[PDB]
Amino acid sequence: MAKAAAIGIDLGTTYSCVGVFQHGKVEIIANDQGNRTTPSYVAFTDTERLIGDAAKNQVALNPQNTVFDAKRLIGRKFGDPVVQSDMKHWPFQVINDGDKPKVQVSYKGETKAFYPEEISSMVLTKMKEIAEAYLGYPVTNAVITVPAYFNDSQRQATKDAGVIAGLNVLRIINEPTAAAIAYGLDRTGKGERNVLIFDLGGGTFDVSILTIDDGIFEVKATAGDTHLGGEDFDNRLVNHFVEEFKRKHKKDISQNKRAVRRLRTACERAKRTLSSSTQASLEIDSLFEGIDFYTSITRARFEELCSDLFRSTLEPVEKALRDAKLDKAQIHDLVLVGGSTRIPKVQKLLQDFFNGRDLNKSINPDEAVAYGAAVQAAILIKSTR
Numbered sequence: 001m002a003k004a005a006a007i008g009i010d011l012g013t014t015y016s017c018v019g020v021f022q023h024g025k026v027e028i029i030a031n032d033q034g035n036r037t038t039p040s041y042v043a044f045t046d047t048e049r050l051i052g053d054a055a056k057n058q059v060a061l062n063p064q065n066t067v068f069d070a071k072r073l074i075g076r077k078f079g080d081p082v083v084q085s086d087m088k089h090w091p092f093q094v095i096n097d098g099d100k101p102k103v104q105v106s107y108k109g110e111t112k113a114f115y116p117e118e119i120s121s122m123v124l125t126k127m128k129e130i131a132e133a134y135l136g137y138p139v140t141n142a143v144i145t146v147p148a149y150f151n152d153s154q155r156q157a158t159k160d161a162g163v164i165a166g167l168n169v170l171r172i173i174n175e176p177t178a179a180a181i182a183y184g185l186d187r188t189g190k191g192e193r194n195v196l197i198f199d200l201g202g203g204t205f206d207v208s209i210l211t212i213d214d215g216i217f218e219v220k221a222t223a224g225d226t227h228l229g230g231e232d233f234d235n236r237l238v239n240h241f242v243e244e245f246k247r248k249h250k251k252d253i254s255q256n257k258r259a260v261r262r263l264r265t266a267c268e269r270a271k272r273t274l275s276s277s278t279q280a281s282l283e284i285d286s287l288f289e290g291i292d293f294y295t296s297i298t299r300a301r302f303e304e305l306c307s308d309l310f311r312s313t314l315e316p317v318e319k320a321l322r323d324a325k326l327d328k329a330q331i332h333d334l335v336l337v338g339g340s341t342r343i344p345k346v347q348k349l350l351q352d353f354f355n356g357r358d359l360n361k362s363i364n365p366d367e368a369v370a371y372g373a374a375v376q377a378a379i380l381i382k383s384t385r
């Protein structure tokens, strides 16, 4: 029953996703708000602790006590230059407890501090409860994914987050490996298969090259930009609309925190529409000083606004190919991961770089990692019996 059941969890920097393999098919489980992905956010309020959508929905009102980006801290020392550099950009406090970072917040009127694994465990507990609500029984066996570049300390702290959350961690697998499993790229029989995973998420960009030799996975190269993602594209739309508001009304809105955040969420929504329509409309009632902001933008203008950013995704692709010592024609499969890979210009740039090649994109790119993890979790629990 429950002992023969296992889930696959994609524990992402900005969003997390949970899947289950049953009756010959993967089911990506929707949360209680009907969303197939859940924000990796934890909010501490005057009455409760919020996780996911509810935590992300109140981030503007409570920024000092809304934790996100815990994956950037997990398994790292406080003195690490990655931690010291990131801390300057977070509205929550990060403290040092014996060279280990802790996030310090106000919770039910009291000062509390949490290890990154305790924060990630709260996200994992939510994914576990989402699966239990869908299945009708508690599931405890899980496969949890991590970036291919995570070291042993980051992998161990992710497994610890799993244990704190009440999960039996069957295996910690690499995100590009879970994505290649999702597409059945390890079941093509004999001979070495070279796979390139292009992973463009909300806040990070990762390029991974894998070799699959008789079901055995080998990471040949990892490249990317840890500070490039979908949120940089939302911000480019924000700056455009701030300048358009200034041209139409001779008013600078940039300082009004509420106006900028309402514009940001509307920009993110319009950006998603631009992946399937050639235009998107913004409808913001009373944006600033009682002025409605009802406008539109073409996909052509959006592509111009992010042009340099989209083109920058090809430098880590080239860097990964040289590190792996492979030419373009030596890559057998191209896999898309991350919600931002739905952007048509991004797909066109990657397809043209690979000389007109077909892309593996039939599985929702923001779900492909949880999908593969769910497949692996089913194989692993069956072998355990």
Ligand SMILES: Nc1ncnc2c1nc(Cl)n2[C@@H]1O[C@H](CO)[C@@H](O)[C@H]1O
Residues within 6 Å of the ligand: 015, 200, 201, 202, 203, 229, 230, 231, 268, 271, 272, 273, 275, 338, 339, 340, 341, 342, 343, 366
């Ligand atoms: N349809 C879409 N067109 C463009 N960007 C998208 C789309 N869906 C998501 Cl999710 N994202 C973005 O992907 C990230 C999460 O993986 C977020 O930045 C989200 O906006």
